[PDB]
Structure formats: structure tokens, C-alpha cells
Amino acid sequence: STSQVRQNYHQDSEAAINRQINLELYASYVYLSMSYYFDRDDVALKNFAKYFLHQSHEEREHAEKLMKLQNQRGGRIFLQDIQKPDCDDWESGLNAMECALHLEKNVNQSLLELHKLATDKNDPHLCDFIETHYLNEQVKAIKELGDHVTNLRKMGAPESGLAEYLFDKHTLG
């Protein structure tokens, strides 16, 4: 049953990739939830909605790239349920950005664990894949979200609806 392509690809690595696929799909779902919260008539921040929808689609692309990797290496994809997000109502633009920052840091932590595994199993291809495609993307995402949180807080969010309105227009627009 060993794939004809498989070489230097540990079972533990294969399993970790399947976990990471699920995590990326979960993140995609979280961002989708956030997006549509901002589309509510009682929230009505269109550029927040757009921002999170973009992030949702990006996370899905990340998942798909891991699926591609799994097959490239001769591993086998095993999908799991995609858990629903932790919240239905994301409260405010600031709260959503803070939740996104937390999520991104969680995803980054997983990726760092995956890199450590790859290095421990002497799988340089896998380690390089993670470095090249995932780790700087995460650092950039985290920095961007932190910047957003800073600005929102400085402007007076979430108490000031004017703050979120103007941030939506000037930063996210």
C-alpha cells in the first residue's frame, strides 16, 4: 500500500499535515462567520465584511495547498468534520480583529510545531514547504492584525461607533 512516490515522508508528518488541513478549513469557516456578521443590517460595516471574506478565501487556498502537498509526497488525505466557530455574534470590529489575531497566532503555533516535526524527522522538503509558503505569511498576518487592533483601540473602539465607521472607510476601504 506504500505510494510509488513516497520517499522520506514519515507517518507522523502525514498525520500532522492532515491536522493542519482541518485547522486551515476551520480558520476559513471562522472568517466566513465574521464576514457575514459585518453584513448584518444592525452592524453594516461593508469593508470589515470584505476583509474577513478575503481572509476566508485565503485560508481555504492554504488548506488546498496542504492537500496538494499531501498527494505530492504520497500521503493520504483524511478529512474530518469542520467545527463551527466559537461565536455567532462577533460584537464589534475590534472584537473580531482581536479574535482574528488570536486565531492567527494559534495557526502559527501549529505551523511551528509542524516545522519542528519536519526538522526532527529530517524532512527538509517539508520544512522548506512550511517556511516558504506558511511562516512569513503568518508573521505578516499577525503584524497586520496587530496594527488594526492598535488603530481601533487608539481611535476609541468599540465605544465609539464613529471609530469603527472611519476605520472601515479609511483603513479597510
Spell out the residues 6+ positions from residue 44 whose beta carbon is closer than 8 angstroms to its own.
38
Nearest approach, Cβ of 39 to Na ion (angstroms)? Answer: 20
Contact indicator for 28, 60 with CB cutoff of 8 Å: yes
Ligand-binding annotation for 62, yes or no, is yes
The CA-CA-CA angle for residues 120, 130, 117, to 5°, reads 20
Using CA atoms, how far apart are residues 33 and 55, in angstroms rounded to an integer? 11
Nearest approach, Cβ of 45 to a second copy (angstroms)? Answer: 8
Ligand-binding annotation for 20, yes or no, is no
Q: Which is nearer to a second copy, 12 or 78 (CB)?
A: 78
Ligand-binding annotation for 144, yes or no, is no
Kindly tell me the burial class for residue 89, based on how many C-beta atoms sit within 10 Å of its own C-beta (0-12, 13-18, 19 or more): exposed
Ligand-binding annotation for 14, yes or no, is no
Residues 54 to 93: which contact Na ion by CB under 5 A? 59, 62
Residue entry with cell 453584513: 39
Nearest approach, Cβ of 103 to a second copy (angstroms)? Answer: 13
Residues 89 to 108: which contact Na ion by CB under 5 A? none
Nearest approach, Cβ of 86 to a second copy (angstroms)? Answer: 11
Contact indicator for 35, 49 with CB cutoff of 8 Å: yes
115 binds Na ion, rule: CB under 5 A? no
164 binds Na ion, rule: CB under 5 A? no
Contact indicator for 73, 6 with CB cutoff of 8 Å: yes
Ligand-binding annotation for 59, yes or no, is yes
Contact indicator for 26, 79 with CB cutoff of 8 Å: no
Q: Which does 78 bind (CB under 5 to 8 A by kind): Na ion, a second copy, none?
A: a second copy
Binding-site residues: 24, 59, 62, 104, 138
Binding-site residues for Fe cation: 24, 59, 62, 104, 138
Binding residues for Na ion, rule: CB under 5 A, are 24, 59, 62, 128, 131
